[PDB]
């Protein structure tokens, strides 16, 4: 489009950000698809441990402050979930970091109690990985799926 009136409407009205929910019944239409669905079951798995050199490479490989993904003009990290023998981060703790950098610092974290598509018997005995728990913007439990 060839003037500023029609530009301000493909930016504000017909843009892809405001077309997240459909007008038919309010269901969301936009989301990740196949190799992203089948990597969240591996990244946010309980086996996924990351060293310090691996942890900051996955944060900056997705969030770049030059292109404007951060909110604090500096990439902030978390303390690891294992300290003494060999310091390690967990894969659910990378999801906490990518939500700590793209959500604004004035608001508090997201509080969500949801479910998955993967049953609690596939992971073993007495696991709770069907229950997705977000507390203060931190994935504490459960893997992430299409759901």
């Amino acid at each position: 489009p060839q003037n500023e009136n029609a530009r301000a409407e493909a930016l504000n009205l017909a843009n892809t950000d405001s077309q997240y929910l459909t007008p038919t019944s309010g269901s969301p239409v936009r989301g990740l698809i196949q190799d992203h669905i089948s990597a969240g079951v591996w990244l946010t798995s309980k086996d996924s441990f990351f060293t310090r050199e691996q942890y900051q490479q996955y944060i900056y490989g997705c969030i770049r402050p030059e292109d404007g993904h951060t909110t604090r003009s500096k990439i902030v990290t978390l303390p690891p979930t294992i300290f003494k023998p060999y310091p390690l981060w967990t894969g659910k703790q990378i999801i906490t970091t990518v939500l700590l950098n793209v959500t604004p610092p004035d608001m508090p974290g997201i509080n969500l109690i949801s479910k998955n598509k993967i049953k609690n018997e596939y992971w073993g005995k007495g696991s709770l990985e069907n229950e997705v728990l977000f507390k203060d913007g931190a994935l504490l439990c459960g893997i992430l799926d299409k759901s």
Partner: protein, 134 residues
């Protein structure tokens, strides 16, 4: 400062579709009402059945602000142990009368403490270091 300390006798080490993480079930040896359920990284700290572990939950380690990798000339509360994790308490529950359970999540590695004398000084804090000796 130590918020909980006891000694737990392991009954079962369940790998359960994981190659590095086992589920531990351990009743203590001092009190009879209290149990443990823990997810340890069994590659770093291998735990067998009928071990005598020593579980301690502290609130900090001794003027820190945020994490920084360890250097020479430091001394921590983690120097006395073998396997230190870090995580948040997210849920409090009383199972019945005379028992109160707390739930921890060490970045997705979960823990459940049940007992009676831990309601004294286990707050709902977003920081409780967990330390295991032997």
């Amino acid at each position: 400062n130590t918020l909980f300390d006891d000694i737990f006798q392991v009954s079962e080490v369940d790998p359960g579709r994981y190659n590095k993480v086992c589920r531990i079930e351990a009743a203590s040896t001092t009190q009879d009402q209290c149990k443990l359920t823990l997810d340890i990284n069994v590659e770093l700290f291998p735990v067998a059945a009928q071990d005598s572990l020593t579980v301690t939950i502290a609130s900090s380690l001794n003027a820190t602000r945020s994490w920084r990798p360890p250097q020479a000339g430091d001394r921590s509360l983690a120097d006395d142990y073998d396997y230190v994790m870090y995580g948040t308490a997210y849920k409090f529950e009383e199972v019945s009368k005379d028992l109160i359970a707390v739930y921890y999540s060490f970045g997705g590695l979960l823990m459940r403490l049940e007992g009676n004398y831990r309601n004294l000084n286990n707050l709902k804090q977003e920081n409780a270091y967990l330390l295991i000796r032997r």
